């Protein structure tokens, strides 16, 4: 082994904590997507023709 | 065997509690705490509730 158990204790704590912060952020950012008037109105184009 | 009996307060209160005494034993008179009076009082056996 390169490090002893006591030397390795805590050497990755910061990175592990940031990774779990990212996981928590992704988990808690779940929320319905936006709705746009453009999407609703674009459906009128189904009857677009040539005059 | 033993019988369940109703010890009734001799303090005049309607308070009664059930004890167990041998059938062959004499009728029971026992000091017991009366909540209404808030004091230890005599209770006398009135009637046999059941046989257990």
């Amino acid at each position: 082994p390169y490090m002893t158990r006591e030397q390795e204790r805590g050497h990755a704590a910061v990175r592990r904590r940031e990774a779990f912060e990212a996981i928590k952020a992704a988990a808690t950012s779940k929320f319905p997507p936006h709705r746009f008037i453009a999407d609703q109105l674009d459906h009128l184009n189904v009857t677009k023709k040539w005059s | 065997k033993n019988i369940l009996v109703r010890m009734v307060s001799e303090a005049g209160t309607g308070f009664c509690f059930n004890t167990k005494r041998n059938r062959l034993r004499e009728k029971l008179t026992l000091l017991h705490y009366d909540p209404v009076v808030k004091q230890r009082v005599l209770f006398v056996e009135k009637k046999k509730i059941r046989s257990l």
């Binding site: 082994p1 390169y2 490090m3 002893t4 158990r5 390795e8 | -």
Partner: protein, 115 residues
């Protein structure tokens, strides 16, 4: 019953003959393992399956770099019969930001910064 196996510590105490055979110096030991999965986790206990998933060795014959530290070594000891471990050798040191995109892991276990 079948259970987890406790490997006696004497198994992981290299001898001078092993040092000569494999070419590793106990002083200044290598920093990083290259671990490849060369054996299926099927027909192996769920705990070995879980260890493999933790180490990220789901794909066989795909080298993965790990720290040569006691905890990683404990997991590797659990699943040592499914993996090939070789030290990661750095003839030119670890890659610099300039040549981070020009590295290649040679089959000998050397990460060369030229490719």
């Amino acid at each position: 019953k079948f259970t987890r196996s406790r490997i006696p510590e004497k198994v992981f105490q290299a001898s001078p003959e092993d040092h000569e055979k494999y070419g590793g110096d106990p002083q200044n030991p290598h920093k990083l393992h290259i671990v490849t999965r060369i054996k299926s986790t099927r027909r192996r206990p769920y705990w070995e399956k879980d260890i493999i998933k933790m180490l990220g060795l789901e794909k066989a014959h795909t080298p993965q770099v790990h720290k040569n530290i006691p905890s990683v070594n404990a997991k590797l000891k659990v699943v040592k019969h499914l993996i090939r471990i070789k030290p990661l050798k750095l003839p030119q040191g670890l890659p610099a930001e300039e040549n981070m995109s020009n590295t290649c892991l040679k089959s000998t276990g050397e990460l060369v910064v030229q490719w």
